[PDB]
Structure 1
Amino acid sequence: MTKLILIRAGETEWNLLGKIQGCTDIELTPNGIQQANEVAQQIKGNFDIIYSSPLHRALITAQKIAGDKEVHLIEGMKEIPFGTWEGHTFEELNGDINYKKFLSGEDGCPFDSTGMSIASWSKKNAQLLLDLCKQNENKTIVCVSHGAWIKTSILGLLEMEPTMYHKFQLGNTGITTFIFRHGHPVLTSFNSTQHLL
C-alpha cells in the first residue's frame, strides 16, 4: 500500500559537463525537459501526492509528472550542498583532503567543508522520508529530488555504510522505488530509466 517513488531531476548543462551543482539553481536543458515529459508519461498519473525540491531542475520535472495535481514544495528535499566543490568536476578535486575521505569512508565521507557528510545526510533524509510516509500512510508518494540527496536517502532507509554511495549510479529522471515489507523499507527498483530514448 504505502509506496515511495524517488525521481531524480532532469538533465542540465552542468550535468553534461560533470560540474557539481549542489545547491546552485541550474536550469534544465531542452533534452532535460524531454526527459521530464517521458518520465511523466511513464508514471501516467499513478501517485496520490507529489512532492518536490524547490530547485528548478527538480520542480519543473515534478510539474510535468504532476500534470493536473499540485506539486508540494519541501525545502528539506533540496539538493545536498557541496560547498566549495560546487562549480568543479570531481577530477579537479584530486588534491582535496576531504575528497580523499569522501571516497575512503573517513569521518562518514565529508561533503567538502559543509560540515556534513554522506553519513549525516543519510540519517537526516531517511528520517524525512519516513515522516512523509507516516503522513501519507497507504498512499503512493512521488518525490522529485536530486542525485546525492536520493543516494543518501537510499543508504539511510536501507541502513547502509556511507561508502556504498559510490557503488550506486543514478541517472536523470531515474526512478527508484520503496515499499515497507515489515515496518522497514524494501527497495523494489533503482534507477529505472527504460522510459528514455
Structure 2
Amino acid sequence: MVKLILVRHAESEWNPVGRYQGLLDPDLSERGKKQAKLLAQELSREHLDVIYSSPLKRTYLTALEIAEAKNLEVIKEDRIIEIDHGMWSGMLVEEVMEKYPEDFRRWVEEPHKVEFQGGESLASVYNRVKGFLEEVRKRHWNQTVVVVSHTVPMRAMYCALLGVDLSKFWSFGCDNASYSVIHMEERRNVILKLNITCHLGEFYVEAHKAI
C-alpha cells in the first residue's frame, strides 16, 4: 500500500486576512514558520520515503522543513499547485463577495461547476491531482509519501481518492500545517486520519470559510 500523508502548507502572510492567493506567491507568516517546524517534528517520528510539494513558497518552505528533518530532497510538483483563482487573485473574501456575488455563490454552493475567469476550473484541478495520485500509487507502492499542497487541490484529491463526486469538495477540513493520513490499498483508498493539527498547540488556526 501507499501511506500518503497529505499536508496543507503552513500559514502564509495572506491567510489571516483571507486574501485569495492562487498562483501568487507570498511568504509564510511568522506563525506559519513556527507551524512548519512543529509539523516537521511530528512527521520526523516516522519513516518518510519521498516528499512532493507544490512549487510555491508557502508549500515549498513547509516541505523543506519536513525534508530537512529527514535528509530528503523535495520534489517540486506542478500537478499539486494551487488553483489559478484568476481575477480573484489578490482580493479579500469580502471584496469578492461584494464585486462578484454570483460567482462567489457558485463557488460556495456548486464548486464543481466553477471556472475562474482568467484562471482555472475546479474540474481541471481534479484532473491534474488525480493523474498525480494515480502515478504515485504505481510508483510508490510500499512507501510513505508526503504531499504538500493547498486547500483546493487537496479537497479535489479527497474526492478523487474516495471516488466521489467533485461536488463534495467542501466537505473536508483543511487547516494550515495539518496532515491527513490516507492508505492507498489494493481495492480502495482509506482516509485513516483527516486534518490533524494536534502538533500545532497554541499555533493552531482554524481555516477561513470559502478558502
- Give the alignment's TM-score, normalised by structure 2: 0.85
**C-alpha offsets along residues 100-158 of structure 1, whole Å, 9 cap, x if unaligned?**
2222327x331421564333422331221121221111110001111111111111221
Mapped to 2, the partners of 1:32 and 1:72 lie a distance apart of 21
Gaps of 5+ in 1: none
Mapped to 1, the partners of 2:137 and 2:4 lie a distance apart of 8
Q: CA RMSD in A?
A: 1.8
Q: How many residues align?
A: 196
Q: Which residue number corresponds to residue 204 of structure 2?
A: none
Q: Does 1:4 align with 2:14?
A: no
Gaps of 5+ in 2: 202-211
- 96-105 vs 147-156, which moves further: 96-105
Query: Is this contact kept in 2: 1:178–1:188, CA < 8 A?
Result: yes
Q: Which residue number corresponds to residue 104 of structure 2?
A: 99
Query: Is this contact kept in 1: 2:48–2:145, CA < 8 A?
Result: yes
Mapped to 2, the partners of 1:166 and 1:65 lie a distance apart of 27
Mapped to 2, the partners of 1:12 and 1:118 lie a distance apart of 22
Q: CA deviation at 1:69?
A: 0.9
Mapped to 2, the partners of 1:55 and 1:119 lie a distance apart of 21
Q: Does 1:132 align with 2:136?
A: yes
Query: Is this contact kept in 2: 1:53–1:78, CA < 8 A?
Result: yes
Mapped to 2, the partners of 1:195 and 1:30 lie a distance apart of 17
Q: Which residue number corresponds to residue 90 of structure 1?
A: 93
Q: Does 1:18 align with 2:23?
A: no
Q: CA deviation at 1:21?
A: 0.5
Identity %: 32
Mapped to 2, the partners of 1:114 and 1:148 lie a distance apart of 17
Query: Is this contact kept in 1: 2:137–2:184, CA < 8 A?
Result: no
Q: Which residue number corresponds to residue 167 of structure 2?
A: 163
Query: Is this contact kept in 2: 1:103–1:109, CA < 8 A?
Result: no
3-state SS of the aligned residue for 2:16?
A: helix
Query: Is this contact kept in 1: 2:84–2:116, CA < 8 A?
Result: no
Query: Is this contact kept in 1: 2:8–2:179, CA < 8 A?
Result: yes
3-state SS of the aligned residue for 1:17?
A: coil
